[PDB]
Design a protein around this nucleic acid. Structure first.
Lengths: 105, 97, 92, 80, 78, 80
DNA sequence: ATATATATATATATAAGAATCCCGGTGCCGAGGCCGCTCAATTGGTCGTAGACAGCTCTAGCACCGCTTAAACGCACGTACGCGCTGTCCCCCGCGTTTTAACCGCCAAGGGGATTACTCCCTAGTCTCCAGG
DNA sequence: CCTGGAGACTAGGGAGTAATCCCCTTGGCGGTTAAAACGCGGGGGACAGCGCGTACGTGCGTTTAAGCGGTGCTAGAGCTGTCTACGACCAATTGAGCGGCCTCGGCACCGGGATTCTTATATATATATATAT
């Protein structure tokens, strides 16, 4: 009658998340509240990532998100750079900064 | 004849983008890059929950293992936000149940 | 000096691959034939290897510049890269 | 054919500009080549090892993803 | 193989830090021993990297900028 | 009761002798205490998380081993 | 010592060579919306093992005091160590030139992810003989 | 004098042999073009060295608490039993997402005017030097 993503109101597939959890060789029994928790947490994290990427795109006056926007969004955010420390973003780079001793006088 | 049914998180996060920035599109290769991001965090914290269930010698993973994985791996406010929305995600999952 | 400073600000905002893809493909095939010959390759694998190597080299050059600044210099030497790889743990 | 000379020193200098280096010495390129050959004999050997138990001589990018995550290098890109 | 940090001030410091998170926490002596061993083995490598940076800075006296470079290359700062 | 001064100056000096340092400046000790403070704010908090997931208030060494292997610090000793 | 006159050096505009953006017009290809349909989600009974809870126990953690002794702090003098600085020279940067290899394009052929005509090996249903109860 | 155990024949299920659907690469061939190698000048930064402040190194006097050890108290970790309840699983249903095809506008691309940038140089001014009574 009602799908669990519609029932919980989350945008993420609770059924697909639970299906990956059951075949993921983590536990012989997987609870019902855990995929809802996982879907809500990943939904908010993806919403934060898309929000910062949209802010970076509006800074670059583009309505299409490029990985340079994600590169400038993750690394500028402190907790995103701290969590995604070893993450390398494809088609990106570094934050544009100039060292003080390399500056012209 | 199509090749295969490749399942992805394209339309869900596309709806997330449309409810965050309705007038902003996204390139598909950046979409697959952050799909790899989402699946990587899934495989990180699901293994974290499995390890925490192994530490309790428990063969069943509840939402409490996911709570411990969130408050261990996520630093700063992204921990305590994701806990706070994660409890109320359960309650609306158990309201009309 | 200033002309050398001009491309410093230019390549910090560009996300294009500085290494030409065909010599990189030749080098990947030359390395891979040493392990096991007659290896078919996808182009996406070569592109992922090229972007990972370029990002790792950019980070290592950032650490090299940090070591050169720490030694009160603006010119880099290989001992900066040696110290960066030793602190990074990449030194075997 | 030796293709270690294909990494031209203008490209190494451009990587140094992207890496933020003011002055580049002439002997930086030799240790740069020595570093990148080690980096391309670790990950490539790991990818060949990942492909070998897949029973193929066709190298896929998912083997490169497995090789990169084996060494801790997290890449969000080609291969998924 | 001896420990240059005394056990009782270190245990006082550990309980002082743990009181900030959760009040009334009982502690094993083995937990304090493992924390002291791990912290000492971590700081010995920190001093080795600091000495390597000071040698790279052409000095025999260590400086805070050596630790600043060593932890930045190590990536311990967010 | 503050106990960050319990890590006394000859203790850090002897540890620097173990660390292979000939001369120690007078202001190294404050940054050493700060880095030890950061490390013990991380590991002890992770151990509190491991203990509260185990429904205990008695902090054990095995939770310390869990917190150390979570951060990649592999140890061979007590706990197992 | 001071008045007069000259010339060298130094700071700031400054104007012309040089690189950058951006508004203006053009396209093109990659987002982005509709059909077909499929496969994975949903719903339902059952049961079975994971887990919560009541109670004991015992076992290690906590506290506190004698004592004593290695350990910590602080003053004193120094001596080796970090640091400015002045030549220097040499190695790397700025720009013109060849050349050469990267890029683009195509094709024919071959390995291969997956699928399929065919085919022999394993398994169970059925028939008739003889041997017993 | 009559039914059941058992060897032989045969239908059905299933996975291995080899060919195939077609798809992705792929070396090879030919035109193009722009990035790299090379070299000349020069300039400015790494380096040597010499002196100069100076700051921990050590050592002894004074303090001091770490730790051993003994005793007592006790909080909860863990074990045992007992109920229970929620997911695992099986079977039927059913609609959501994936693929494919059209389509259309967001952004790549050229380009000249406006915008800085920079950088040697013109010019106003501070100061060292020469002469004489």
């Amino acid at each position: 009658a009602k799908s669990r993503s519609n029932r919980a109101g989350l945008q993420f597939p609770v059924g697909r998340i639970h299906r990956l959890l059951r075949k993921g060789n983590y536990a012989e029994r997987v609870g019902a509240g855990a995929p809802v928790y996982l879907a809500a947490v990943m939904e908010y994290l993806a919403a934060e990532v898309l929000e910062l990427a949209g802010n970076a795109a509006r800074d670059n006056k583009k309505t299409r998100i490029i990985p340079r926007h994600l590169q400038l969004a993750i690394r500028n955010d402190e907790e995103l750079n701290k969590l995604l420390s070893g993450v390398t973003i494809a088609q990106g780079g570094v934050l544009p900064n100039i060292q003080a001793v390399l500056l012209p006088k | 004849k199509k090749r295969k049914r490749k399942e992805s998180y394209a339309i869900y996060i596309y709806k997330v983008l449309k409810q965050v920035h309705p007038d902003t599109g996204i390139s598909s290769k950046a979409m697959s890059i952050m799909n790899s991001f989402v699946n990587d965090i899934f495989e990180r914290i699901a293994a974290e929950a499995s390890r925490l269930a192994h530490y309790n010698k428990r063969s069943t993973i509840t939402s409490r293992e996911i709570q411990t994985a969130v408050r261990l791996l996520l630093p700063g406010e992204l921990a305590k936000h994701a806990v706070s929305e994660g409890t109320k995600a359960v309650t609306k999952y158990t309201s009309s149940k | 000096g200033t002309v050398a400073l001009r491309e410093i600000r230019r390549y910090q905002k560009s996300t294009e691959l500085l290494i030409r893809k065909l010599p990189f493909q030749r080098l990947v095939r030359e390395i891979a034939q040493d392990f096991k010959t007659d290896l078919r390759f996808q182009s996406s694998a070569v592109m992922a290897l090229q972007e990972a190597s370029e990002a790792y080299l950019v980070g290592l050059f950032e650490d090299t510049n940090l070591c050169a600044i720490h030694a009160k210099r603006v010119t880099i030497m290989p001992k900066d890269i040696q110290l960066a790889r030793r602190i990074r743990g990449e030194r075997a | 054919r030796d293709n270690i000379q294909g990494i031209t020193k203008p490209a190494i200098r451009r990587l140094a500009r992207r890496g933020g280096v003011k002055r580049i010495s002439g002997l930086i390129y030799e240790e740069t080549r020595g570093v990148l050959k080690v980096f391309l004999e670790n990950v490539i050997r790991d990818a060949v090892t990942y492909t070998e138990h897949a029973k193929r001589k066709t190298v896929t990018a998912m083997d490169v993803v497995y090789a990169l995550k084996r060494q801790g290098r997290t890449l969000y890109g080609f291969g998924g």
